[PDB]
Amino acid sequence: YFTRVHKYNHVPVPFILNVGMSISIVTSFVYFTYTSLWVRPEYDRVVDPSKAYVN
Amino acid sequence: GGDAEILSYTEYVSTVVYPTIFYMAITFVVSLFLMYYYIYGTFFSSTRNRF
Amino acid sequence: PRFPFQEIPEIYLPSDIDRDPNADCWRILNQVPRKEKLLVEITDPLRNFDFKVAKIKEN
Amino acid sequence: MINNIMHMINKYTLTTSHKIIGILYGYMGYIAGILGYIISMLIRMELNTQGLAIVRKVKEVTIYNNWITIHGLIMLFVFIMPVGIGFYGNYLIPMLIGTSELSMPRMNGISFWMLIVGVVIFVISNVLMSKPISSGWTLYPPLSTRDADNIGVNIDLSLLVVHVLGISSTIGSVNYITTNKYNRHVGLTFMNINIYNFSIIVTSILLIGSLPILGVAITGLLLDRNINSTIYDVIGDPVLYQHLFWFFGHPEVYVIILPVFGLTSLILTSIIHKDIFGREGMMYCIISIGVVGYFVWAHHMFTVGLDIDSRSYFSIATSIISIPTSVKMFSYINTWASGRGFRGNNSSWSFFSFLICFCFGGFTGLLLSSGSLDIMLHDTYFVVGHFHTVLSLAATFGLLIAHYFFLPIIFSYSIFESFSFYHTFLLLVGALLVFYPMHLAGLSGMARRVPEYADIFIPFMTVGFHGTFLLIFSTLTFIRSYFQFLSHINHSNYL
Amino acid sequence: MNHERPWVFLNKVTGKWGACGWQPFWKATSQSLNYIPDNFIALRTNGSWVRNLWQSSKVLDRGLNASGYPTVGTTDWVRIPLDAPLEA
Amino acid sequence: HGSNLYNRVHGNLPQLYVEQLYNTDEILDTVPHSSDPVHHMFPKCAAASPLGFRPYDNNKLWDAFVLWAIVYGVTTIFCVLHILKYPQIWKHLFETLTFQYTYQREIGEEYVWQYGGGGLNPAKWRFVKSPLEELGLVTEYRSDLDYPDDL
Amino acid sequence: MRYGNREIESIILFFDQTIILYTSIINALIVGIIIIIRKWYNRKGICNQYIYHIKIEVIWTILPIIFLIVIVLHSVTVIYNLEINKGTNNKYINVIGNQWYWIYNNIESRISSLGRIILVDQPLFIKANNNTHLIISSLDVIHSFALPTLGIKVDAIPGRINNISINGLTQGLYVGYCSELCGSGHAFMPINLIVY
Amino acid sequence: MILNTNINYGGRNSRLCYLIPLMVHTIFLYLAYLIYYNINLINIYLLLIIIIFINIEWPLVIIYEYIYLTNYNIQNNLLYNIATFIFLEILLFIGFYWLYINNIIHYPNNLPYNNNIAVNLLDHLNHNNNTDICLYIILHNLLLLLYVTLILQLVHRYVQL
Ligand code: HEA
Ligand code: HEA
Ligand SMILES: CCCCCCCCCCCCCCCCCC(=O)OC[C@H](COP(=O)([O-])OCC[N+](C)(C)C)OC(=O)CCCCCCCCCCCCCCCCC
Ligand SMILES: [Cu+2]
Ligand SMILES: [Cu+2]
Ligand SMILES: [Cu+2]
Ligand SMILES: [Mg+2]
């Protein structure tokens, strides 16, 4: 017998656990991709051509 | 021994594996948020008093 | 901690440097126990330092 | 007794039986491990105390440099590969596929005795002779060719040692692949051979593809030293040497690690009384790690001056290699679940230590993959922490699992579990005290290969002192346990 | 090793019995896989002394007139051997 | 174990064992026979375990020496060679481990002490005085020893 | 507390992001392993059939990938941010790594006795907020100019002229090292930079 | 009669298990001696005689084992090992080529001479040509090796058919 074929041993995920895991993973990915690639304020530039100095 | 708790595949997956992963996901999100606040000091504004 | 440039005979110095003994440019920022950190290094918890860091436009 | 003596010598020199060659590899590996440990203790005693307390002169730091280089070479090329691949590879590979011998029985003996020749040359060159090689285990020119402390012939003898070890490894690899491909018993397909055989096959494929390049690099060094060419001189390309050496360098690392994965998987099947979770997944991940290790060699040269595009590319490739190892770690964690592993077994606890330490070392090494962040961590103690919390806590503990699982089988005497518990736990705690501080001493700027350090770094070396004492205790416990293993009782009375 | 076979102490005035024998012991270490320990308490025997003790327990507890057995020093204890079942 | 030569000669193709009366060892270089004894890996262990015995007995001097050589042999050979070639390194190690060597230590001074917590941080360190000289075992520090000048 | 440069700040922030990610992963796995071990040691939750789960395996292979592309992108951008300031300079300095001492514009710098291992008799001076180009190489063997607190660590290889761009914002003395085995006096070959 | 075993090659004890390692040891210590004292310890021709003599063992055992112990499983093992060895040789050649073309693919270079056009009549094609390379003689050698390859392939096919 091939006892690990698709038709055998399917365990559905409870809806509550499915929702909780989905929310957790989506939140984590969104938060990380945001705070890493979007909230990057050290890349600051100032546009002021009058701050040049030539003797 | 005679006291060992033996579960079938379905029972084990349903009553052990899935709740474990659920708790792990909760820990993941909570730790991400609390660690980011712990270091930078702000939840969404990067370093505190610097920007 | 400060760099002792007055104890070194015949040391080249820039013409446009401040030679006052207690100038800012003679401080030793790292590699010495200080009790007053002037540099933010990769091992410094700003939380342990209460985030008393300078602004972004300054520095 | 002349006949008996000559018969024993012929038994252990003319042999081609895989079991005998395996035990010989194991013996040589353990001996070289102990020697490397002694040299490591010398290095640690040099670091712990202040004021060049052992060499006593700045001019004589060449002794310390020789210590570090021979420590590295001994522990890499004569401790792990002979044990991980030579010992269990020869002893088990024919048995696990149901066959008598390896293919090419004579080349197996040739491999072992090439290893012994290399060890002999190395030991004579670096002990009985004066002013030995002192250029770190990565023999970077022009330091290893155009220097003042490296002029003797024994340096060239050490390079030839590297050559013989390469020859031995190539022979062993070819033999393992060939035996595993054609001698399988009827009804066993190539991808149904157990996990250890597959990992050995991929390791052998790794060794075959890279060793000739290392041979080319070493021949370049020898030619520069002897016939006075200029391949690696001020008008040469020391970076070319680095490229070749490190093209060999990382495949060697994965060659070291993978057989430990195979052995741990096999032993787990034997002690948890359950099959491997996702065996096909683990085998595919092993081959993936093997293949991806051939495209990442230059993550060891981020500060040499590589092109910016190449820096980015090699950071990318290192992350790619990081993925499948994570898959394997998760597979292990799930394998142990639902099983009935023995609750009081040094094999079980050594497996736990292996898993934890490998995860931590993999993370720390994944930090180093980023080219930019490798600016601040190249040639500090962070790299030392990394490759010692992988080599000396994941490879060593995997071999401890194998050692405590296969001693009863080979010898037929059970294991003194309390003794082994003391040994393994003190090795764990002592080693962590030695290497963990290194990490935070690397982020603080302490360079490596220095016998004398600035006063800012005292606390890390104090914790290292503590760890070194615990390590001495653990290794003495281990050796005395083994001596007690093969010795009959010493006390007996009437109660 | 060769010591005495297990015996039975029996105290007369108190009328109380109990088995006994010589227990070898050694410092603990690794065992051997291919060896099941032989009979060490009763050397060179098929281990019948357990059966003899079990059979003789009812005889001894019921009250035995063991005046025909040797004593142990100057005490009130006598030795009964367990070579053969005791009936009296 | 015991030779199987009688069976080999009375076997089925005895001509194959004519070489066995030349200068030739039976176990290593003779054609194996259907009824040969089974040879084990570690014959000493194989013969001792079923009798309950560990292969080596410490009470026998020969066995004690053999086991010492097996376990501690090359280790002590390497140590002896190293000590013969580098007498000064072990001399210095002995000096340091016995408190005979002090780099620049003085009398009555206090020195910084910190266990962990990253690099030297003045808010965590202590200062320690030498208990040896607090008791009285030390009054002056030896100067005849080698000194790492220019450091 | 100032940062001493912008490149060091960027590297530090990238480091902090990776640290947060790895700590989160470690905490998740620690909770999982705690549950598993607590169940195991008490002889609970046994199932010899549980040796395969297609969905779980696919998901646990996918998840590390998505969280890794972000790290890779951030690292690449940090590299290029390190390397943009080239070409906007007005001062050039050349550095030679000799055998256990440094040379700046043909002026030698060796360790001194006033400081134990950190201080030097002749520092290297650069002006604050002024972009400078360092042309680094070596005469005898390979050294490594290492000032990791300013985000500079470049090997001085014989016959190979490396070219890095250095910029200072905080005035003071930065201590650095050789960060590459070069001989006996490797541990005593320090670097001193003064931003004034 | 004779009791038949499995199809694998059982394995024989042989002196080649240590002679080849001793030969390598001898070669390397001989080279060390020649490097140190600038004079050979023993005559090079005697050394080569020893090396040749030790290695005549392989053909003898080859003949006597093909006469007795050979089947298709053994033949396949041998052929696969040959393939792996040829792969190793190809890799060695690739490595040496790497060590050769390294400083030729990086076209810009520092040269003692001038290689800019319009200063002399033979300077533009200076850096771009290494004239002393024995061109048409190398061509003749290539023709010889092509002869050998094609002849051998033709004869191999002819005998196989
Ligand atoms: C597998 C390789 C391996 C192993 C096992 C070790 C083991 C140890 N190593 Fe090292 N090490 C290297 C590989 C290894 N090392 C390399 C490649 C370098 C770099 C060389 C260079 O930089 O050029 C290096 C450099 C290095 C340094 C560099 C110092 C300097 O550069 O500044 C230091 C100092 O702290 C050190 C310490 C130790 C210690 C204290 C141990 C051990 O004491 C801790 C663990 C000890 C064990 C107990 C293992 C001993 C094994 C046996 C006990 C055999 C018994 C049998 C088995 C269990 C199978 N190692
Ligand atoms: C001994 C075995 C071994 C192993 C397995 C590794 C694995 C890795 N190593 Fe390393 N390494 C060495 C041995 C090893 N290494 C040695 C000896 C040196 C020093 C040579 C010397 O300089 O002398 C060295 C040096 C070294 C450097 C040198 C840094 C420097 O010198 O500049 C770098 C940097 O790129 C590096 C990176 C890696 C990476 C990225 C992995 C990755 O394979 C790690 C992957 C592991 C995992 C990732 C764990 C699984 C993680 C999870 C469970 C999920 C998390 C996953 C994601 C979020 C994606 N290693
Ligand atoms: C509530 C009590 C907390 C734990 C008590 C012990 C730690 C004391 C306070 C810790 C913070 C201040 C650091 C000073 C001391 C740190 C000691 C240490 O291990 O440092 C390494 C490391 C060094 O890292 P660290 O201290 O730099 O941590 C980072 C700190 N900041 C936030 C400032 C950046 O210390 C730690 O990891 C801290 C926790 C240590 C707890 C150890 C418990 C396990 C014990 C294992 C065996 C150790 C044997 C030691 C025996 C000593 C006595 C006999
Ligand atoms: Cu690598
Ligand atoms: Cu240097
Ligand atoms: Cu240096
Ligand atoms: Mg370096």
Number of helices of chain B: 1
Q: Count the strands of chain D?
A: 1
What's the main sheet of chain B like? none
Determine the number of helices of chain D (DSSP H or I, runs of at least 4 residues): 13
Overall shape of chain B: rod-shaped
Terminal Cα span of chain D = 43 Å
| Greatest contact between two chains | D-G, 77 and 72 residues
- Supply Rg of chain D: 23 Å
Strand content of chain B: under 5%
Order of helices and strands of chain B: H
Helical residues, percent of chain D: over 70%
How many beta-strand elements of chain B? 0
How would you characterize the overall build of this protein?
Chain G: Cu(2+) 2 binds at residues 178, 180, 182, 186. Chain G: It is found in: Membrane; Mitochondrion inner membrane. Chain G: This is Cytochrome c oxidase subunit 2. Chain G: One of its GO terms (molecular function) is copper ion binding. Chain G: Cu(2+) 1 binds at residues 143, 178, 182, 189. This is part of a larger assembly, with eight protein chains of eight kinds. Chain D is mostly helical and 495 residues long. Chain D contains 13 helices and one strand; from the N terminus they run H-H-H-H-H-H-H-H-H-H-H-H-H-E. Chain D has helices at residues 2-11, 18-48, 61-96, 105-128, 153-182, 195-226, 238-271, 279-292, 308-336, 346-367, 381-411, 417-442, 458-485; one strand at residues 492-494. In chain D, helix 12 packs antiparallel against helix 13. Chain E is built from one helix and four strands, in the order E-E-E-H-E. Chain E is elongated. The termini of chain E are far apart. Chain G is α+β, with helices and mostly antiparallel strands and 196 residues long. In chain G, strand 1 (91-98) and strand 2 (101-104) form a beta hairpin. In chain G, helix 1 packs antiparallel against helix 2. Chain G is elongated and about 75 Å long. Chain H has five helices and no strands. Chain H starts with 15 loop residues before the first helix and ends with a helix. Chain B binds chain D through residues 4, 12, 16-17, and chain D through 337-338, 340. One copper (II) ion binds next to loops of chain G.
What topology does this entry show?
The structure is cut from a larger assembly and holds 8 protein chains of 8 kinds.
Chain B: H1 9-40
Chain F: H1 5-9, H2 43-48, H3 61-85, H4 87-97, E1 110-113, E2 126-129, H5 131-135
Antiparallel strand pairs in F: 1-2
Chain H: H1 16-37, H2 44-55, H3 57-68, H4 72-105, H5 135-160
PDB class: electron transport
Keywords: supercomplex, membrane protein, Euglena gracilis
Entry title: Cryo-EM structure of Euglena gracilis super-complex III2+IV2, composite
